[PDB]
Amino acid sequence: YAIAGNGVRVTYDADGQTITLYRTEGSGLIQMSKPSPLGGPVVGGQEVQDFSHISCDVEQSTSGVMGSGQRMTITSQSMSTGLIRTYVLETSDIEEGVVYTATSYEAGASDVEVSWFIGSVYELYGAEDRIWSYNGGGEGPMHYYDTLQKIDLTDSGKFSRENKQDDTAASIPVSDIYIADGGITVGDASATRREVHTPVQETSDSAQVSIGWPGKVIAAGSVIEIGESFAVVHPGDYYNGLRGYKNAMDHLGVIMPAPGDIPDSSYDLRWESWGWGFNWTIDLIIGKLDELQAAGVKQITLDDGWYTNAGDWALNPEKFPNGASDALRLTDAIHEHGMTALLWWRPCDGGIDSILYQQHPEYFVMDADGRPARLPTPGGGTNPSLGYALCPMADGAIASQVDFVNRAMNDWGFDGFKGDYVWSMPECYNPAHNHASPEESTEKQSEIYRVSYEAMVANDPNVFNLLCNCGTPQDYYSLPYMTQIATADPTSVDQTRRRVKAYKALMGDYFPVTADHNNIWYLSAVGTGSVLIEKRDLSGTAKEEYEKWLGIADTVQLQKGRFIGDLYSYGFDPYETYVVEKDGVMYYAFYKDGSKYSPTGYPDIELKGLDPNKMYRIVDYVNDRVVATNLMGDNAVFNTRFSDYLLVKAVEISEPDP
Secondary structure: OEEOOOOEEEEEEOOOOEEEEEEEEOOEEEEOEEOEEOOOEEEOOEEOOOEEEEEEEEEEEEEEOOEEEEEEEEEEEEOOOOEEEEEEEEEEOOOOOEEEEEEEEEEOOOOEOOOEEEEEEEEEOOOOOEEEEEOOOOOOOOOOOOOEEEEEOOOOOOOEEEEEEEOOEOOOOEEEEEOOOOEEEEEEOOOOOOOEEEEEEEOOOOEEEEEEEOOOOEOOOEEEEEEEEEEEEEOOOHHHHHHHHHHHHHHHOOOOOOHHHOOOOOOOOEEOOOOOOOOOOHHHHHHOHHHHHHHOOOEEEEOOOOEOOOOOOOEOOOOOOOOHHHHHHHHHHHHHOOOEEEEEEOOOEOOOOOHHHHHOHHHEOEOOOOOEOEOOOOOOOOOOOOOEEEOOOOHHHHHHHHHHHHHHHHHHOOOEEEEEOOOOOOOOOOOOOOOOOHHHHOOOHHHHHHHHHHHHHHHOOOOEEEEEOOOOOOOHHHHHHOOOEOOOOOOOHHHHHHHHHHHHHHHOOOOOEEOOOOOOOHHHHHHOOOEOEEOOOOOOHHHHHHHHHHHHHHHHOOOOOEEEOOOOOOOOOOOEEEEEEEOOEEEEEEEOOOOOOOOOOOOOEEOOOOOOOOEEEEEEOOOOEEEEEEEEOOOOEEOOOOOOEEEEEEEEEOOOOO
């Protein structure tokens, strides 16, 4: 009982009721998971472990969700509860290493109450001393939980992490665990948001990844579908798993922006207005335009403090005493100096003391007790800055968002918007809205994002749209309507670099991604291929450094290059590495300041991805020095010592150097 579509091989054992996963390399296969159970519901606080195999049927040539492939069905029966389980696994020929899972439950005797459903449990095989994991998250601590974590296998303790997707958690519903040989990625398969758990558990000698959904009462004689999930068995690191997941979900209607439709203003260097904090004035920004124009900045954004209240989105009289005239003047100055203008924005907010709530209570979300609800911070808390949420199924909220977009784009003059400081939508209990379920409000933020982006596009084909789910991984269902992605206020440099790699995997090689500006890491911004942006009012030696690195970024242009991340593996390679291709010439970035993963000694450096039949000269462009020469593409090994970083490029040479 086995199927194998492309790059995978799933086998089922009738006697033990276990599933084993493989991955194809060369002409053979590599084991990637030890035998694992199928999974079942949680009845009475304990998972049912009385399921008995009935029959298994395998179909060799079927068409399914992702196209042509294979499918086999497993039917099991439980005597204690009377439930009947049907398990369906699907693979496709075109897609490499993706498995589709579907579950259905039927109650034949009497009512069965289920508190949680469990499927697709897989345990890693071949682990030796450590396992690196990717966590979709959504509920973790805001600014201090890395999206990539290490599971040490020599520790006394154990590592467990439950990545939730609920009313207080909105992020990518994907988790991945990998070792040097490869890894396994499990993620949701749904075109719209729902409730899904992606736990990562450390076992006695390995780690586990799983999928889970909430349950409800199953009536007698009724068939209910629980959920669906995607399993990715890949070689390498989380980049391959995320890329496979994106390719798989491209078949469910979730399609990311194409490289030929991203506006050219997305790649331009940007300067935030955080230099003076909340005490900024129009005159200061106007007077700071000449220096940035000389340096090479081609984008200016307006941050917090310009509005009176959220929802109303009226101009603050303190910052704009003359009204729309001042905004037009600032926009005209920015345009005259050859730059575009953006605006700060909190999409789903509606305020607490705003006129929108004072005059129109009926567009907001109602709690269980009959009171307005507030936007939740990750975990379930409340921040004073955040206000009441706006129900997506009320026409007033959509009308207000469109009105604000049109007013900003046609009256004041602005070429884009910056979404910030919002995470999730609470449940609504208002009977007037006629909600089918209280969760209907939580599953429809994509409607607000889509409507706002449609208005923006209708006003101008080339627009800037970025959302900051600051602290946590960004909402997956807001991705199709963006043009740039940030790293959501990373705390350390390793965080922003790893998140840049992950978002390149999810989005695409050419998608604009920035490395944020919380701390000065120009090296990591340039080396990873991100967009260099700044917030401060710099003067002196740091000002000279800022201009120098702006010039380097302008003369290299790695933000418009192609990102390659499948060659090397993170956590099982001598250095933390990132590869960018620009006009044929390959660029490399090696790092050592990644406190999470830094090596001892000075290991040799191997450049892979080069033509074997070509001779290359390796020259650093930061200092204009030839580190190595006469290096054939096959060997491509040279020994060098550096403190923190090493940025190099492979310049082709027709004849050997002297």
